[PDB]
Scaffold this active site. Structure first.
Site, PDB file in Angstrom:
ATOM      1  N   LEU A  38       0.809  -1.236   0.000  1.00 19.29           N
ATOM      2  CA  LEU A  38       0.000   0.000   0.000  1.00 19.29           C
ATOM      3  C   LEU A  38       0.836   1.277   0.000  1.00 19.29           C
ATOM      4  CD1 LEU A  38      -2.644  -1.050   2.759  1.00 19.29           C
ATOM      5  CD2 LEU A  38      -2.754  -1.349   0.258  1.00 19.29           C
ATOM      6  N   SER A  42       9.915   6.497   3.960  1.00 17.82           N
ATOM      7  CA  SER A  42      10.805   6.672   5.106  1.00 17.82           C
ATOM      8  C   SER A  42      10.285   5.909   6.321  1.00 17.82           C
ATOM      9  CB  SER A  42      10.961   8.168   5.432  1.00 17.82           C
ATOM     10  N   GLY A  44       9.131   2.905   6.110  1.00 20.13           N
ATOM     11  CA  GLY A  44       9.245   1.460   5.876  1.00 20.13           C
ATOM     12  C   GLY A  44       8.327   1.008   4.746  1.00 20.13           C
ATOM     13  N   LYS A  61       2.623  -2.812   8.916  1.00 20.81           N
ATOM     14  CA  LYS A  61       3.783  -1.951   8.710  1.00 20.81           C
ATOM     15  C   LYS A  61       5.072  -2.736   9.013  1.00 20.81           C
ATOM     16  CE  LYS A  61       4.255   2.034  10.996  1.00 20.81           C
ATOM     17  NZ  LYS A  61       3.822   3.546  11.119  1.00 20.81           N
ATOM     18  N   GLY A 115      -8.771   5.197   1.754  1.00 21.04           N
ATOM     19  CA  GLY A 115      -7.631   5.904   1.194  1.00 21.04           C
ATOM     20  C   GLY A 115      -7.246   7.147   2.039  1.00 21.04           C
ATOM     21  N   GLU A 116      -6.198   7.832   1.569  1.00 24.35           N
ATOM     22  CA  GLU A 116      -5.624   9.037   2.216  1.00 24.35           C
ATOM     23  C   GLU A 116      -6.410  10.291   1.870  1.00 24.35           C
ATOM     24  OE1 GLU A 116      -1.556   9.294   0.733  1.00 24.35           O
ATOM     25  OE2 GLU A 116      -0.899   7.444   1.749  1.00 24.35           O
ATOM     26  N   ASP A 155       3.459  14.889  13.333  1.00 23.85           N
ATOM     27  CA  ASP A 155       3.492  14.508  11.899  1.00 23.85           C
ATOM     28  C   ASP A 155       2.166  14.803  11.202  1.00 23.85           C
ATOM     29  OD1 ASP A 155       5.172  13.656   9.693  1.00 23.85           O
ATOM     30  OD2 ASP A 155       4.643  11.539   9.921  1.00 23.85           O
ATOM     31  N   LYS A 157      -0.274  15.918   8.536  1.00 29.66           N
ATOM     32  CA  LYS A 157      -0.153  16.205   7.088  1.00 29.66           C
ATOM     33  C   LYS A 157      -1.243  15.367   6.414  1.00 29.66           C
ATOM     34  CE  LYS A 157       3.550  12.842   6.353  1.00 29.66           C
ATOM     35  NZ  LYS A 157       4.870  12.629   5.675  1.00 29.66           N
ATOM     36  N   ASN A 160      -1.331  11.425   6.178  1.00 33.40           N
ATOM     37  CA  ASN A 160      -1.491  10.627   7.381  1.00 33.40           C
ATOM     38  C   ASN A 160      -2.929  10.518   7.880  1.00 33.40           C
ATOM     39  OD1 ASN A 160       1.232   9.952   7.440  1.00 33.40           O
ATOM     40  ND2 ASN A 160       1.794  11.388   9.180  1.00 33.40           N
ATOM     41  N   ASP A 173       0.346   6.650  11.561  1.00 33.48           N
ATOM     42  CA  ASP A 173       1.770   6.969  11.598  1.00 33.48           C
ATOM     43  C   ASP A 173       2.118   7.779  12.847  1.00 33.48           C
ATOM     44  OD1 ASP A 173       4.492   7.395  11.198  1.00 33.48           O
ATOM     45  OD2 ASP A 173       4.303   7.683   9.034  1.00 33.48           O
ATOM     46  N   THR A 190       7.665  17.102   8.149  1.00 36.63           N
ATOM     47  CA  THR A 190       7.764  17.519   6.762  1.00 36.63           C
ATOM     48  C   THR A 190       7.921  19.045   6.665  1.00 36.63           C
ATOM     49  OG1 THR A 190       6.225  15.685   6.444  1.00 36.63           O
ATOM     50  CG2 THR A 190       6.628  17.088   4.542  1.00 36.63           C
TER      51      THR A 190
HETATM   52  C1  LIG Z   1      10.154   6.499  12.892  1.00 40.25           C
HETATM   53  N1  LIG Z   1      10.870   6.629  11.610  1.00 40.25           N
HETATM   54  C2  LIG Z   1      11.536   5.346  11.225  1.00 40.25           C
HETATM   55  C3  LIG Z   1      12.810   5.072  12.055  1.00 40.25           C
HETATM   56  C4  LIG Z   1      13.605   3.832  11.597  1.00 40.25           C
HETATM   57  C5  LIG Z   1      13.407   2.570  12.103  1.00 40.25           C
HETATM   58  C6  LIG Z   1      14.129   1.466  11.703  1.00 40.25           C
HETATM   59  C7  LIG Z   1      15.063   1.657  10.750  1.00 40.25           C
HETATM   60  C8  LIG Z   1      15.270   2.898  10.229  1.00 40.25           C
HETATM   61  C9  LIG Z   1      14.567   3.983  10.649  1.00 40.25           C
HETATM   62  C10 LIG Z   1       9.969   6.967  10.470  1.00 40.25           C
HETATM   63  C11 LIG Z   1       9.220   8.339  10.511  1.00 40.25           C
HETATM   64  O1  LIG Z   1       8.064   8.341  11.398  1.00 40.25           O
HETATM   65  C12 LIG Z   1       7.162   9.450  10.994  1.00 40.25           C
HETATM   66  C13 LIG Z   1       7.512   9.769   9.525  1.00 40.25           C
HETATM   67  N2  LIG Z   1       6.318   9.801   8.660  1.00 40.25           N
HETATM   68  C14 LIG Z   1       8.518   8.618   9.184  1.00 40.25           C
HETATM   69  O2  LIG Z   1       9.565   9.099   8.324  1.00 40.25           O
END
Ligand SMILES: CN(CCc1ccccc1)C[C@@H]1OC[C@H](N)[C@H]1O
Length: 339
Positions: A38, A42, A44, A61, A115-116, A155, A157, A160, A173, A190
């Site tokens: 989906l 950043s 994952g 996730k 959806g978003e 966060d 936006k 989300n 998120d 952001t």
């Molecule tokens: C929390 N981090 C991931 C940290 C991480 C974990 C494991 C490996 C690398 C990195 C993500 C951010 O949370 C809000 C934003 N929408 C998103 O970019």
């Protein structure tokens, strides 16, 4: 107002009980069938999955442990899981399972097929003020809840905010959410949505969420955000300048609310004064809002997304489908002991 005071008093009791005793390890990967990716980014990957024994659909996730480069990223993912397993509110996506294996961390949440909000905004062009007000009221109540628990969200936006089967918001998120007694200092968010005190590397507080609500209401009513440019450094220059231009179709009440949310001095910003959230709830732009009715989901929504069933993915977009690989050996065990 005693029914509100006792509501938030019980909310905090119930949060603290789960906060002090988090659950862990409540399913595993081969309990689910993978359907579709989906989103990827950043945060994952998020995949649509189906539980083999119940047939229920979920949004899973997936975080890759070995893509950590900073200790604050670990802290952030631990924040997200501990906060999501402890909160409960009508407009927040619910976490159903969490677990980890040799390679990944997993958070399995309810799947919201509409959806978003971002997609619907860009398709419609802009929302009428009553439509934007219906969504903004749900965010005001959600921040009143989160802030009373000493949590900051950080966060907000349109990507989300998911739209559910009843046309109401579910916030997803919690990657930047944090429990905070006073101030905090991490650079995150952001660029379009960052408050001036984050850009200037100051210690900051829950006022940054009310600034972000100002950006979100402007974007919903205009169709574009108030501060934009090709480089983040140019965006930052407009944000700290103290200057915003409003479309002529904005009502006078809307402009007045936005000047008070998009107040560059954090000690003068609505939501951060002596009357807290009530400067917002009592503002003239919300005069037609029944706050209890919204909370109880008794108001008819502006629109209901079109979808065929609880497994329909047509309101999300298409991504390259990649393997979920789980190494023969464990990676990064200690750092994620608490997960
Ligand atoms: C929390 N981090 C991931 C940290 C991480 C974990 C494991 C490996 C690398 C990195 C993500 C951010 O949370 C809000 C934003 N929408 C998103 O970019």
């Amino acid at each position: 107002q005693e029914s509100v005071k006792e509501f938030l008093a019980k909310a905090k009791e119930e949060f603290l009980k789960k906060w002090e005793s988090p659950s862990q390890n409540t399913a595993q990967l081969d309990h689910f069938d993978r359907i579709k990716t989906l989103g990827t980014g950043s945060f994952g990957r998020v995949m649509l999955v189906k539980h083999k024994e119940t047939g229920n659909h979920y949004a899973m996730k997936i975080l890759d442990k070995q893509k950590v480069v900073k200790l604050k990223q670990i802290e952030h993912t631990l924040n997200e899981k501990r906060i999501l397993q402890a909160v409960n509110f009508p407009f927040l996506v619910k976490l159903e399972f969490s677990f980890k294996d040799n390679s990944n961390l997993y958070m399995v949440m309810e799947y919201v097929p509409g959806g978003e909000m971002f997609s619907h905004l860009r398709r419609i062009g802009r929302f009428s003020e009553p439509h934007a007000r219906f969504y903004a009221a749900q965010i005001v109540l959600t921040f009143e809840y989160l802030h009373s628990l000493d949590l900051i969200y950080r966060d907000l936006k349109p990507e989300n905010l998911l739209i559910d089967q009843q046309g109401y918001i579910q916030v997803t998120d919690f990657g930047f959410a944090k429990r905070v007694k006073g101030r905090t200092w991490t650079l995150c968010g952001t660029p379009e949505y960052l408050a001036p005190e984050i850009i200037l590397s100051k210690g900051y507080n829950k006022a940054v969420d009310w600034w972000a609500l100002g950006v979100l209401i402007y974007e919903m009513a205009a169709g574009y955000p108030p501060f934009f440019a090709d480089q983040p450094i140019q965006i930052y220059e407009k944000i700290v300048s103290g200057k915003v231009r409003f479309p002529s179709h904005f009502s006078s009440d809307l402009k007045d609310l936005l000047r008070n949310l998009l107040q560059v001095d954090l000690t003068k910003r609505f939501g951060n004064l002596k009357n807290g959230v009530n400067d917002i709830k009592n503002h003239k732009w919300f005069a037609t809002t029944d706050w209890i009715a919204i909370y109880q989901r008794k108001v008819e929504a502006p629109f209901i997304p079109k979808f065929k069933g609880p497994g329909d993915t047509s309101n999300f977009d298409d991504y390259e489908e990649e393997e979920i690989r789980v190494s023969i050996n464990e990676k990064c065990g200690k750092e994620f002991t608490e997960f």
